[PDB]
Design a protein around this nucleic acid. Structure first.
Ligand code: ZN
Lengths: 29, 95, 135, 24, 91
RNA sequence: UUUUUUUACUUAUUCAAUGAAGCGGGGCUGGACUUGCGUCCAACUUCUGGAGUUAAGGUCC
RNA sequence: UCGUGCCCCGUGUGGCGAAAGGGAAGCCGGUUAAUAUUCCGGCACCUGGAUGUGGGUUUUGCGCGGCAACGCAACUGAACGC
């Protein structure tokens, strides 16, 4: 059995929402 | 029409004019109606709406300013929010 | 109707515990001689349990799931009541008016509140009460 | 074991409470 | 007790600058020094701090406005046609 | 094969912006028209002078 | 530990330029032919460093009190931010 205190906190990466993740920016280096 | 109903409540019923007395009425749970002026700050408006939702009190958004709401109550001072505790002989509650 | 009853969850807005979540143990609407205004006897969380991730050890989880409670006489004007309720049988009459007149009674009451709140938190229920407010 | 039993009792109580709620 | 017949607030300028110029400046000085009713809190405490900048002493709101009046008629009419265009676009 | 006219293009050259961050083309989903399935157009935050950062989690080891 | 690697971050670039701008901290008494907030005497302060003692906190681990404004000799707080 898993711990009931463990929580999922999804991030929304739409415009105006949460900070963008670190993507591969090698095309624009 | 709401001005005429308000004048009838001032003449016959019981009201409290002002933010702190309105909050005290909502906490007591004997408030029958809440009137919120148009130019009330949005934070205070949201607080009053939350209090009225928790006490199950109807809310009327008065389209005038606090100056107009005080004039409608018949006072020479502004009023951003007010509570009707007793309707009196008016039908302001039936809406 | 009235909403400031027993098991009502509120937010403290003034004082040292501003921003903390409390549960109303006892409402005193007509006030007393010491506090001649509508007030409440409440119990709340001073230090929230820390966040628990899936790779923590059992000892670290047990360390981070500790709750520091507090008890308070608080004015109604310094509370922001919420639609949430928290019903705990172990907190029934855990504090009263003369609890706050003796430091050892406060300590025993805080021990009881800590035990009951930690049982409820370990149950996994009422997660909104045990997460801190962000402001 | 006692901690788990206390947590289970508190969860059962919470579920039952939710069921019953649903001039000087 | 009225102290001057016609100069009003322009009486500080004495006999200088010409009657028409003093009369022209008088309107702007009266409107730029008058107190206005705040649209946010309803108190009569809005006053100019700089040109185009009007602040309320009570609720501490600062508003971008006209040079010598709180609002300009062009901006009021512009707000009206903006509301009309927004209603047309939404409907 | 060459001379004029316009009429496209991009690789020289020129200008601007940025912490060189999301360009171009597909896929997925939804909506419109169309032919009876090709286009174009959209994904994502609007009552509030709050907060937003050290990945939570899923699944194989 | 496939041991001779991997990860995070973005903000740019240095120096000179004020004995009236900004700025850590010293007062009183006495003393010489001539110096003194600089010398002598008394009484202090600032900055930085090391490491003790007392006191505090903690077996409800990181203080308690006041409705509140806030108080009290203490009373953890890196990155990154306001
Ligand atoms: Zn104002």
């Amino acid at each position: 059995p898993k711990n009931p205190l463990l929580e999922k906190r999804p991030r929304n990466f739409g415009i105006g929402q949460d900070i963008q993740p670190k993507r591969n920016l090698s095309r624009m280096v | 029409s709401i001005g005429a109903k308000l004048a009838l409540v001032i003449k016959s019923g019981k009201v409290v004019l002002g933010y702190r007395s309105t909050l005290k009425a909502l906490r007591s749970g004997k408030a029958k109606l809440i009137l919120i002026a148009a130019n009330t700050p949005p934070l205070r408006k949201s607080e009053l709406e939350y209090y009225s939702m928790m006490s199950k009190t109807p809310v009327h958004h008065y389209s005038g300013t606090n100056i107009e709401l005080g004039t409608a109550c018949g006072k020479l001072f502004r009023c951003s929010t007010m509570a009707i505790l007793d309707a009196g002989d008016s039908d302001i509650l039936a809406d | 109707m009235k909403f400031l009853k027993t098991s009502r969850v509120c937010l403290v807005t003034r004082g040292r515990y501003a921003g903390k979540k409390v549960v109303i143990i006892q409402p005193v609407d007509q006030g007393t001689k010491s506090h001649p205004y509508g007030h409440a006897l409440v119990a709340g969380i001073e230090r929230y349990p820390s966040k628990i991730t899936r790779r923590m050890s059992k000892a670290r989880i047990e360390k981070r799931s500790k709750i520091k409670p507090f008890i308070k006489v608080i004015n109604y004007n310094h509370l922001m009541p919420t639609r949430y309720t928290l019903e705990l049988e172990g907190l029934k009459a855990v504090i009263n008016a003369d609890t706050f007149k003796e430091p050892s009674q406060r300590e025993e009451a805080k021990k009881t509140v800590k035990k009951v709140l930690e049982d409820r938190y370990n149950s996994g229920k009422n997660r909104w009460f045990f997460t801190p407010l962000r402001f | 074991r006692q901690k788990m039993e206390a947590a289970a009792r508190s969860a059962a109580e919470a579920e039952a409470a939710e069921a019953r709620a649903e001039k000087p | 007790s009225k102290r001057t017949k016609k100069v009003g607030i322009s009486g500080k300028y004495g006999t200088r600058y010409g009657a028409s110029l003093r009369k022209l400046v008088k309107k702007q000085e009266v409107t730029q020094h008058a107190r206005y009713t705040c649209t946010f809190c309803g108190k009569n405490s809005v006053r100019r701090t700089a040109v185009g900048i009007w602040s309320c002493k009570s609720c501490k709101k600062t508003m971008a406005g006209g040079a010598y009046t709180v609002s300009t008629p062009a901006a009021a009419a512009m707000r009206s046609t903006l509301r009309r265009l927004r209603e047309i676009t939404e409907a």
